[PDB]
Amino acid sequence: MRDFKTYLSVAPVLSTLWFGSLAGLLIEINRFFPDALTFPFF
Amino acid sequence: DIAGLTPCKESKQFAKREKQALKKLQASLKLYADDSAPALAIKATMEKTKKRFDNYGKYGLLCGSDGLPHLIVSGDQRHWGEFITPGILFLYIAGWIGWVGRSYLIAIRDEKKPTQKEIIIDVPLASSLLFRGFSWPVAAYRELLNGELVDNNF
Amino acid sequence: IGPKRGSKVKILRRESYWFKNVGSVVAVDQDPKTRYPVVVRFAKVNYANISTNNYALDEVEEVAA
Amino acid sequence: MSHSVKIYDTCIGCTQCVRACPTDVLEMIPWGGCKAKQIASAPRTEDCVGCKRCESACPTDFLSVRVYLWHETTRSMGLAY
Amino acid sequence: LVDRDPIKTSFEQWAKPGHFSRTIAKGPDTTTWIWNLHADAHDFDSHTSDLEEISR
Amino acid sequence: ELDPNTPSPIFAGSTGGLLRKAQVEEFYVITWESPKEQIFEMPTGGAAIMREGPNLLKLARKEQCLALGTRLRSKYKIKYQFYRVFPSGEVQYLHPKDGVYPEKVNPGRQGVGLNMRSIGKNVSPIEVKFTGKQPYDL
Ligand code: CLA
Ligand code: CLA
Ligand SMILES: CC1=C(/C=C/C(C)=C/C=C/C(C)=C/C=C/C=C(C)/C=C/C=C(C)/C=C/C2=C(C)CCCC2(C)C)C(C)(C)CCC1
Ligand SMILES: CC1=C(/C=C/C(C)=C/C=C\C(C)=C/C=C/C=C(C)/C=C/C=C(C)/C=C/C2=C(C)CCCC2(C)C)C(C)(C)CCC1
Ligand SMILES: CC1=C(/C=C/C(C)=C/C=C\C(C)=C\C=C\C=C(C)\C=C\C=C(C)\C=C\C2=C(C)CCCC2(C)C)C(C)(C)CCC1
Ligand SMILES: CCCCCCCCCCCCO[C@H]1O[C@H](CO)[C@@H](O[C@H]2O[C@H](CO)[C@@H](O)[C@H](O)[C@H]2O)[C@H](O)[C@H]1O
Ligand code: SF4
Numbered sequence: 367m368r369d370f371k372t373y374l375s376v377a378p379v380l381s382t383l384w385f386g387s388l389a390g391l392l393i394e395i396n397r398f399f400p401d402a403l404t405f406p407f408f
Numbered sequence: 409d410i411a412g413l414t415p416c417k418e419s420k421q422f423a424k425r426e427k428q429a430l431k432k433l434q435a436s437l438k439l440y441a442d443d444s445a446p447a448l449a450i451k452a453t454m455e456k457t458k459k460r461f462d463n464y465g466k467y468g469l470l471c472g473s474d475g476l477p478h479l480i481v482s483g484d485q486r487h488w489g490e491f492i493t494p495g496i497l498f499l500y501i502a503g504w505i506g507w508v509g510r511s512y513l514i515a516i517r518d519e520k521k522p523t524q525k526e527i528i529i530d531v532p533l534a535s536s537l538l539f540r541g542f543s544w545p546v547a548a549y550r551e552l553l554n555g556e557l558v559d560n561n562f
Numbered sequence: 563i564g565p566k567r568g569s570k571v572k573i574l575r576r577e578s579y580w581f582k583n584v585g586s587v588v589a590v591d592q593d594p595k596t597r598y599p600v601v602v603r604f605a606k607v608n609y610a611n612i613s614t615n616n617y618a619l620d621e622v623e624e625v626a627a
Numbered sequence: 628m629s630h631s632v633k634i635y636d637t638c639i640g641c642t643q644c645v646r647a648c649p650t651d652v653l654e655m656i657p658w659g660g661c662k663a664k665q666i667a668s669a670p671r672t673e674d675c676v677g678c679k680r681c682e683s684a685c686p687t688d689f690l691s692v693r694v695y696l697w698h699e700t701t702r703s704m705g706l707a708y
Numbered sequence: 709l710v711d712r713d714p715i716k717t718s719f720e721q722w723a724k725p726g727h728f729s730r731t732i733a734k735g736p737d738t739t740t741w742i743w744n745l746h747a748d749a750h751d752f753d754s755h756t757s758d759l760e761e762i763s764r
Numbered sequence: 765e766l767d768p769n770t771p772s773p774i775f776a777g778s779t780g781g782l783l784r785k786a787q788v789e790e791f792y793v794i795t796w797e798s799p800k801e802q803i804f805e806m807p808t809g810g811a812a813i814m815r816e817g818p819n820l821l822k823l824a825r826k827e828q829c830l831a832l833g834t835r836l837r838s839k840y841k842i843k844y845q846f847y848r849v850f851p852s853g854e855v856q857y858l859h860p861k862d863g864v865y866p867e868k869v870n871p872g873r874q875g876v877g878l879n880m881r882s883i884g885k886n887v888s889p890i891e892v893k894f895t896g897k898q899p900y901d902l
């Protein structure tokens with residue numbers, strides 16, 4: 367229903383469903399690794 | 409190793425921090441949860457900052473006086489990924505913020521009246537020009553400096 | 563239509579808002595006579611609420627060409 | 628100057644364009660060819676204060692006037708009283 | 709404004725640049741009108757020259 | 765005053781208009797026509813009526829007495845007319861002169877619009893050092 371060469375719109379602040387959430391999933395990485403200050407690698 | 413002291417393998421001052429400070433976390437002989445199922449200083453908050461024992465990983469990590477750990481990162485003895493490892497990371501992530509900045513933008517100024525399509529958003533995030541960033545191998549590191557954004561357009 | 567009337571022109575005066583930028587034109591003057599002919603027009607507004615100005619061929623440096 | 632703020636433009640046509648401004652501007656002085664043929668930038672300006680209501684409307688395409696007069700009477704500021 | 713009415717759309721106004729004083733948000737693009745819109749959003753010199761609604 | 769009472773533009777009181785500096789220097793005053801008894805708006809905050817006579821209200825300073833237009837022409841009438849009174853006579857015949865309605869053609873009068881050179885590239889700053897022999901007193 368969405369193929370090739372840009373799509374459908376969206377509101378003024380879907381940024382408030384982008385600050386809240388996405389970014390929100392990141393506390394979700396900041397407790398899985400409840401900590402940082404350098405980091406091991408994969 | 410360098411200006412401050414040595415890591416965790418020994419750091420006296422650092423040790424004292426572990427202990428007083430946190431463990432006075434204690435400080436509440438009891439405070440009632442003999443069996444009780446809520447008040448969670450008790451379990452972790454300490455232990456999660458704490459079972460962080462004579463281990464924190466081991467990280468090297470220099471630690472000065474008062475034993476709070478300092479970051480050198482000069483690419484030596486041990487400390488390399490306290491800037492570069494999380495540095496290229498900052499670069500890569502940004503730049504694929506604005507590679508697409510210069511994208512769900514350079515895809516509009518055309519067709520028919522295109523004068524604020526941007527207060528609404530055509531493909532949300534761009535969700536089309538999206539991956540162009542991870543789908544940057546090399547990319548702007550050549551095509552930016554040769555063609556398109558070409559000195560012409562400069 | 564035969565030569566070029568109003569098909570693409572830069573501005574070069576340095577006072578004019580969209581100066582170095584090239585937008586589109588319209589009914590450029592006919593006669594031998596005056597000194598402020600040529601309407602020009604482009605999308606981008608400017609410091610006034612309404613911006614659709616008239617410059618004049620002593621100049622339009624279009625420039626290459 | 629003594630009131631010298633340039634609002635001039637090129638059309639100096641004054642229909643659905645600009646009129647506003649306490650006394651100062653008795654123009655319509657048609658110069659021998661400028662479209663709606665009324666031109667220049669002022670009349671006798673030794674009369675009124677310092678607005679920029681002067682543009683706000685109808686082009687000056689450059690600057691637009693403001694206070695610049697310095698030499699400044701009193702009838703030139705409401706308050707000589 | 710249409711879109712178009714009076715009387716003779718249910719079809720709601722989602723899409724076509726502007727609304728709020730009449731050489732309105734103009735086709736031609738700008739930012740000021742994005743603090744406009746929120747500010748003076750409630751006001752009454754515009755919406756209609758006629759009491760009526762406003763109290764409604 | 766009263767022994768000569770010649771009025772026209774009704775009001776009653778007000779701490780608004782005319783005070784000491786309209787004798788000791790200049791004066792300024794507006795006059796007008798009108799149909800039938802109508803209540804107006806006023807400069808200086810107040811508000812009254814009309815009917816006629818000369819319909820000749822006197823006003824502190826001339827920015828004040830043209831505002832009868834900036835509303836007092838959203839209330840019918842060709843004719844409204846302000847002059848300049850002194851403490852003795854004339855020169856400065858204010859709305860007198862020639863024609864009227866700032867947007868017509870009889871003569872040209874003053875104005876000019878140019879300086880020496882026109883709006884063009886005055887990236888050229890201030891020129892000569894101000895010296896009594898080269899046309900910069902205009
Ligand atoms: C997409 C984005 C974009 C890009 C590629 C740039 C790029 C640039 N900006 Mg910039 N900027 C932006 C948006 C952007 N900006 C926005 C929204 C603002 C707020 C008005 C600014 C305010 C700003 C200022 C004051 C300055 C710059 C400057 C610069 C230049 C220096 C980089 C820097 O250190 O600033 C870092 C970047 C910012 C501070 C911008 C924050 C906004 C970002 C996060 C936009 C993110 C994308 C956004 C959500 C778009 C939606 C995506 C869409 C496809 C769906 C660089 C050319 C500097 C300059 O002129 O020197 C050359 C100057 O200091 N910017
Ligand atoms: C009973 C009354 C109440 C009501 C119903 C109104 C209604 C109105 N007022 Mg009003 N007003 C009130 C009390 C009220 N006022 C009070 C107490 C004051 C004194 C401060 C004012 C001062 C005032 C002014 C100066 C103006 C109005 C205007 C208006 C009109 C515009 C409303 C609008 O668009 O929203 C405006 C609201 C916003 C744009 C939202 C922005 C709010 C910001 C500043 C946030 C506040 C800080 C807060 C801590 C931030 C949130 C937390 C954050 C840190 C996350 C509207 C008819 C305006 C007008 O033009 O009349 C037609 C005019 O601007 N009011
Ligand atoms: C965690 C981390 C990471 C991540 C990163 C990222 C990706 C990010 C981010 C974040 C971000 C990316 C942020 C940003 C933001 C932005 C901003 C915040 C902006 C702002 C703006 C401004 C502030 C402006 C202002 C102004 C203007 C507009 C102009 C002029 C005027 C003024 C000044 C007002 C990594 C891993 C990599 C590394 C490590 C750490
Ligand atoms: C090793 C090291 C170092 C070095 C440094 C140096 C030497 C620096 C300089 C630097 C520089 C000298 C820089 C500059 C460069 C140039 C340029 C020119 C850049 C750029 C750019 C651009 C152009 C970008 C763009 C973009 C992108 C890519 C993304 C998207 C879009 C945008 C726009 C954002 C340091 C210090 C860090 C420290 C330690 C480490
Ligand atoms: C209920 C309700 C309410 C309330 C509201 C509120 C109060 C809200 C708030 C909200 C909030 C209060 C929010 C906040 C947010 C914040 C956050 C979310 C934070 C964060 C973050 C992040 C995620 C980040 C991170 C990071 C890191 C890691 C480090 C640095 C960098 C960065 C920043 C990136 C009311 C009454 C109105 C009414 C209606 C309903
Ligand atoms: C009784 C005889 C009087 C009728 C006058 C003839 C005009 C007929 C249209 C109805 C009145 C006009 O508008 C009135 O009704 C509209 C629905 O129609 C309402 O709503 C709409 O109308 C407005 C214009 O008036 C629009 O600009 C508004 O954006 C819209 O919401 C308004 O809140 C109200 O002001
Ligand atoms: S309207 Fe403005 S000529 Fe036109 S800009 Fe000069 S006064 Fe009349």
Ligand code: SF4
Nearest residue numbers: 648651676677678681
């Ligand atoms: S801009 Fe100047 S001259 Fe014009 S009305 Fe205002 S004060 Fe008078």
